[PDB]
């Protein structure tokens, strides 16, 4: 359910998380020291460990003779971008301070403190359908850093579930939505807003950035109560834009929330009801208005069980 | 707890409202009925219709709360309106009323009034009520007037904030208006404008919420709003997802309406509307009923326009 | 000559309109039926509904006139409209249509288009028609869309001005609009604004009438108007008798609607609307029927507002 | 029906018009060389001939012992003005060039050319009810001139059926409307607009003045057609304002119309249909924009039978 | 139908004009003479010459038309002008004249006035006249004043447009001007500018034509013009073929002058000048006579300049 | 007079039109299956049929030993252009939908519908002198298309009687004018405006293009009357520019006119007087402002007898 560990290199994190998944019944179609093709009852995913980063992609079928980025219905070729790039999570060379892993039969969440105050999330799973009838729903998110030393959360940066970024090559997260607007079932919609593509998706990923496009943003800003110092969980609703520019609410992120960390220290819990919450910062602790050099006070909350 | 009907006139409509509040089988069986602490007709009607004044007490679901509300009927034949005014309070004392004047000043921590616009004629009407909040909707031809008041649901224990009273009406009650008003200020609960929704702060000071700014309104309320329809604060474009929202494969998503205040002193989340949500327009409209998890929801639209951002659903239970 | 009903959708509504125009017992018995000279569907619908185009010929009451009208259905699912466009003309030639493009340019002395706003759903509808003019009204919830076209009644012999064709619609047909539009430009016949009513001059040049001025509109039409609602030209105050008009002891006065042009070159009275009048609002509203001298009149209001100056009655015969 | 004559003094006009009325069955309750109290099935009127003007008043009952301005229900005391003055028509000392008289069982119309180009109307009758159920409807109108030599149609002037005038002493015309807003039946409403009195009446009297309050004014301006030189009759609708400032259309002036005389000479007829029309200027012939020294081109049209 | 002479003064010139119109052998023999319906001298001349006013009626060639024209003489000694004003109309009534003022307002659908500039002295003069149109030219030293009025020749049957009356003069008649005026506005028939040529529309509204634009002129006339000299609308250069036109081997080409209107409502060709054409300047000038097909044509030039685009020929028959 | 037919290839059109000319007395100096040298009392012409186009030239004398483009006084060498090219009419490979031919003793007019909505004119004759004394007057016009798929009436295109074109190699029409400005009698002036050559000619050919140089252009725009839906014929006057930049009107095109086809369908007749008119579009039916992809609404009118 909740595991903690350490890793000097990304390969160690990779080995440990596969060990955990296998111990929990996760089905790995093909495994190696650096490359994974795995699946569950919900979807198929493929991962590869680089020297200092992780490459992730979704999948719809399996072929052992195809490369890690060439599986049937892979997101590389079936996406609106002209660049045709897969999901990237840019890590460091290590050693990593620690890693915190949430494992379930339907989703896998990871938060790695690579260095003092430096954190990277890696998210995989399927959105809670909540009774809505749609095929797909599998989401894969990584973390990207623009340039060290300069504004780290600059406009060109992309983040999990992000609603605003400028980049023509790579995406930080992606969501499956099948048969949208009469197209072929395999459709891997990225989180983009400026490409003006007919079909796309959007989320609260950046939190409370000045130009974040989501109507629940104010809730995150207001997630903290000054009168009683109480904090609440805000569902992470995702939105989809179709051909006629007519949006459709698609769902919420399972067991996940976003909040303001103004009055909380990293890891400080606040039990709301019978369920317990673990809160950690996205990238690093800074001030309220430091949207350039850090991730301000946005905090990711996971339900610990 | 719910009644759909047609009242022959405004006086009969108010009579039916009170009969519903005191004799609905659910209310009496569960012992949730309200108490009329006051009922009077003080003024000497000239070229105007008779004025009814009522003050009722609600005990809440648990029987340990104290809710005080006031209703009024005020009309003028020459201008041809039969407005219904509403207000809320915590205490009442008929002896506190000064000579002449009015009784709504006798309320302790009195709040300004809101209203609904009607006239003397058969009017289709929809009443919803629960021990903590009441909602009124009236179908005037192609227009829908709507108002109500009650307790919101804060995320904190009631022990320290026992009194989260909110009042909402289609237009401010400080002026007399004719229901044929076409101005943008005549609007609904989901989008207050120009003193159309008030909420009582835990400090005991009433704060007004507006989804859009206004010079005539006081500066303090510009900072506090209903975020769902107030997405324009953070977005850098006129057109956003909220105005382009639409159903999903026949499923209509219900979005909760949220109070929020963003002051310089500090931030605070206050709560949600109990039984009110936002819903889209395309392929749908008012009088529609949608069933979610075995619970039905009715649809309504604001008088000014029936566009996407002006269309809200109310839970009927 | 009159039909009240509910059309399952816009296509069925147009079908019912044509069936009324060709098979109403009064029309066939008196030999006043219109002739469909053209019917087609040229475009390849993409993310849009099928487009119907119709061109019909009316002979008039006396059988010696020549009236040509055109109707169109145009819709888009993504924006969710199923608009109905209308135009008038004097001659038609399918061979004159250039490659591609559209057929409405083939009309000799072609006039720009007007429209009515609807969608694909059951809609209550009211059709009126006579050998010289047709009127369409549609009840969209609490809103009423209205349009029509035909000959006005000039005070001069027909021998020199045989062709007094007028066309009126709720909004200009040069742009696509969604019927949830709440702008002040979306209005009715009794008060055209921004290219919502055109009339053909005896010289053969189409002139537009507007009851209120507008910068976006061309300067020439500022001088020509519908006087009844355009009393503001001569009065020195915003509030006038026309907006305060009200019934007299239960009798509702019907006031004729008048075309007038006041140019620098010279003045000319053009005529009246046949079967359209202004009526007040107080104590009344749409769907009302009033009987004068054994002739009934129905009431309707404009989409923007239902105030006194935006409420007109149509003769039902 | 249509009589023409001459008179050196107002007394002669008076004698001739009484002779005509008596010959037509009009009932004169009391007659003298200078004072009249007469009535018909519709109403009661009283007239007195001064040295150079006529004084007119309405009546509701008769008393031979009361003065000309003291009859029961007289307009002098039963009107909203504080001044309490009766109707006045200011004439000249003569000799009068001519007089044109229209006589019927229900109304009496007079147009006197006192001098070359100088005309005075005098109107009495009852509005055509047109099926509207109301008690009263009797109207009496005279003509007032502000000051000779200066702007003759100045703002302070008052005219028959006028909709705009400034004066605190006398009125140029008046209309009966009984039981308005629950008041006593005897009510003689004057044509005034600036007194802000709760109950009053208004008409198209001044024609097309810059500040005339009537929505049909544009019709008079447009009464002439340039394309075919055709002229039409515009009904003279009267309006009433009550306590709640809510207006009520009351009726139209029988056999009377107003038009523009731009392309017509005085007395020039234009037969519209089977009925024949006689058109005459109100005060004098001038130009289009001479609203100060003359009555511009406003022309009164009577149906001749 | 033609007279060349020298009038001792403006009064004698007008006398000779009327004597020509009533006693020319062609006019009387063919029964085409005009009728003087009015002749008067209303004003009391102060430091001014006597004012003559005349109104004449022409029956047309076929004897079934009704043409009404008015002429006036107006002069001032101190400023030393003896202007002659002209106007056209359809009806006349001496009783319609208001007290004082003037009689030209009595005309039904009265048109504004044009004029010609002369003085009290021997002046050479050229009159042309036919039952439908009259032309006047006067040689003032090296300048040539010219004016006239009558029916144009539309390409459509007279049955529906019986009344194509046009009036043209060298300068606008709304102001008093001295014939020594050297401004560019003082010009001729072939090129109206600033209200120097009016034409009656079939709708009954007078429209002004100008070959060049002008801010002081109203916006509406900018769209309607005389195309022949108005080639600048479509050409992308100042110098065009029309200003460089020249005779061909001694043959002088006569080009018809054309009315045209290009409005937003629609287009319409109106007709040609009967007996007026454009001709070049080089190697030629005024007083020249050129014979084409046995029909002679005289030459004339405008007061401002005698350049190529300001030189027109008139048919003498 | 008026013939209609069909042709799968240009050679068929050629054979049929020679058969028609011979049947009407036209004198053909030399004939072949593809090359013609013919003449009448007015002038001499030479035609050659290519695979998909026609080559035309004027002539002043005959020599059977010279090629089709080498006859005495041929326009190729006796023209101001440096390129020295003959007249070209660019057709298609067929099959041609139809062809409409007007034949007379003095001129020959052809309008070929090569495909649905695609029309090509070919004009030969002599201008009506109208009593003007000048030698020559023979005009030969063809049709040129710039590039299919792009703006078909682009600026570089040339058309019969055109007044504005940009091209250095070929011309679309040409007119004889002998002895201009003291030059040798053989002079074949082309329709050009931008070459600034001392001697040239201009016509209304393009109709109502934005940059068409002709003063009668407005007539074509105004050729339609909205009030009565009437259409008139506008003479097609031609202009000539000489050495001193002093123009000379030269004549009009016989039995030919130009008009606006806004309210007319192709082939729709309108009998103006006792003579009957046939109207056809120049290139294709489009809209009012489509001067790029089609020939807008310009219509050529021929008097049918």
Residue numbers in the entry:
A (entry chain E), D (entry chain B), F (entry chain F): 2 to 306
B (entry chain C), C (entry chain A), E (entry chain D): 2 to 318
Wording from the paper:
Bacteriophage Casadabanvirus JBD30, from the order Caudoviricetes, is a temperate phage that infects the bacterium Pseudomonas aeruginosa. The virion of bacteriophage JBD30 is composed of an icosahedral capsid, long flexible non-contractile tail, and a baseplate. Using its baseplate, JBD30 attaches to Pseudomonas aeruginosa via the bacterial type IV pilus, whose subsequent retraction brings the phage to the bacterial cell surface.
Three tail fibres resembling bent arms protrude laterally from the baseplate. Each of the arms is composed of three heterodimers of gp47 and gp48, which are rotated 180° relative to each other. The folds of gp47 and gp48 are similar. Gp47 was classified as a hydrolyse belonging to a nitrilase superfamily of proteins. In contrast, gp48 could not be classified into any enzyme family. A loop and three-stranded β-sheets of gp47 form a positively charged surface depression, which binds the negatively charged α-helix of gp48. The gp48 fold is stabilized by a disulfide bond between Cys142 and Cys174. Bacteriophage JBD30 uses its baseplate tail fibre to bind the pilus. The arrangement of the three heterodimers of proteins gp47 and gp48 is such that they form a unique interface, which can embrace the pilus. Side chains of pilA residues Lys68 and Lys112 are predicted to interact with Asp185 of gp47 and Tyr169 of gp48, respectively.
